[PDB]
Write a protein that binds this ligand. Structure first.
Ligand code: NA
Ligand code: NA
Ligand SMILES: [Zn+2]
Ligand SMILES: [Zn+2]
Ligand SMILES: [Zn+2]
Length: 327
DNA sequence: CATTAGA
DNA sequence: TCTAATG
């Protein structure tokens, strides 16, 4: 957790590099498992050879460990850290819609900077356009103060459109959190579930609503169940306009909302942990359901859920406020 | 680990 | 269709 801190970090730097700059999925997959096990190793790694004993570490990584142990740095690391091409990719990549692939491609054509990007907006698609356009606000955190305002607005329209609608803003915001990255709104309706063959309009109506009043300004991606966009709080009585924020609305079959809602609220650890418990307690929990465990090794048959309560009950736990779903 | 774009 | 990107 810190005893092997640096080694795991150099290692991540490394893996991360293979993956983006070059396309060395293995090297890259290599670095990660190593960074996984040494992280676990309950002792201070004093030399490669020692590390070496590990499963995952080979002669390769051993080597790097030595040098780093030896001298407070890594050359390969110093070099990559320096090199502009690699720098550039790690940068373009920051743009919503720009991934490693397009990053390497733009680089190879010479688009290295954000300006370069502008001059060549034609080379960009719609997602990437929006990304470029809101680059700044996109890197910005969301004050909870703003979060509640937002939430307020979405909830009301959703309601006004159809009172049957059910929405939950999940995420950290849900878990109390002082700030959040983007707004995730979990959505489901009663006429929509597991079987009842869709009702795309069900998503589509609200999206339309939200745009109608300018809450939604842009559209990154709109499908029959997932809409990815950009929204914005009405810039008051001027002097101050609100930064553009990422927003995702998603359709859920009412018969699997809570699993979903439960799920998405996290924390990543609360999950796994909740997840690990359901196993002893003879179950299975995943993104959409909770199934009883069968001795034959496995089993199925989807437990009927009406709230986050039922789930706990099932695995017979204490209902944990989302506030305290921290781990 | 799954949904939407794209070309 | 595959492949990218975001989640
Ligand atoms: Na080994
Ligand atoms: Na990006
Ligand atoms: Zn020891
Ligand atoms: Zn989020
Ligand atoms: Zn999101």
């Amino acid at each position: 957790e810190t005893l092997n801190g640096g080694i795991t970090d150099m290692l991540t730097e490394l893996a991360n590099f293979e993956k983006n700059v070059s396309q060395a999925i293995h090297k890259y997959n290599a670095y990660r498992k190593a960074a996984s096990v040494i992280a676990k190793y309950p002792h201070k790694i004093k030399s490669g050879a020692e590390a070496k004993k590990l499963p995952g570490v080979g002669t390769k990584i051993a080597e790097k460990i030595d040098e780093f142990l030896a001298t407070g740095k890594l050359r390969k690391l110093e070099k990559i850290r320096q090199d502009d091409t690699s720098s550039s990719i790690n940068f373009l990549t920051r743009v919503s819609g720009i991934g490693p692939s397009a990053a390497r491609k733009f680089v190879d054509e010479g688009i290295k900077t954000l300006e370069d990007l502008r001059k060549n907006e034609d080379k960009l698609n719609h997602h990437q356009r929006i990304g470029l356009k809101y680059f700044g606000d996109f890197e910005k955190r969301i004050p909870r103060e703003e979060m509640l305002q937002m939430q307020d607005i979405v909830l009301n329209e959703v309601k006004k459109v159809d009172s049957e609608y059910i929405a939950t803003v999940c995420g950290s915001f849900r878990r109390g959190a002082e700030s959040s990255g983007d707004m995730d709104v979990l959505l489901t309706h009663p006429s929509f579930t597991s079987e009842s063959t869709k009702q795309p309009k069900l998503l589509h109506q609200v999206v339309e609503q939200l745009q109608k009043v300018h809450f939604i300004t842009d559209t990154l991606s709109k499908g029959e169940t997932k809409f990815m966009g950009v929204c914005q709080l009405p810039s008051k009585n001027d002097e101050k306009e609100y930064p553009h924020r990422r927003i995702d609305i998603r359709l859920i079959p009412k018969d699997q909302y809570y699993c979903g809602v439960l799920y998405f609220t996290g924390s990543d650890i609360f999950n796994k942990n909740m997840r690990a418990h359901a196993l002893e307690k003879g179950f299975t929990i995943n993104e959409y359901t909770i199934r009883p465990l069968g001795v034959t090794g496995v089993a199925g048959e989807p437990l009927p859920v009406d709230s986050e309560k039922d789930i706990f009950d099932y695995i017979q736990w204490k209902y944990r406020e989302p506030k305290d779903r921290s781990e």
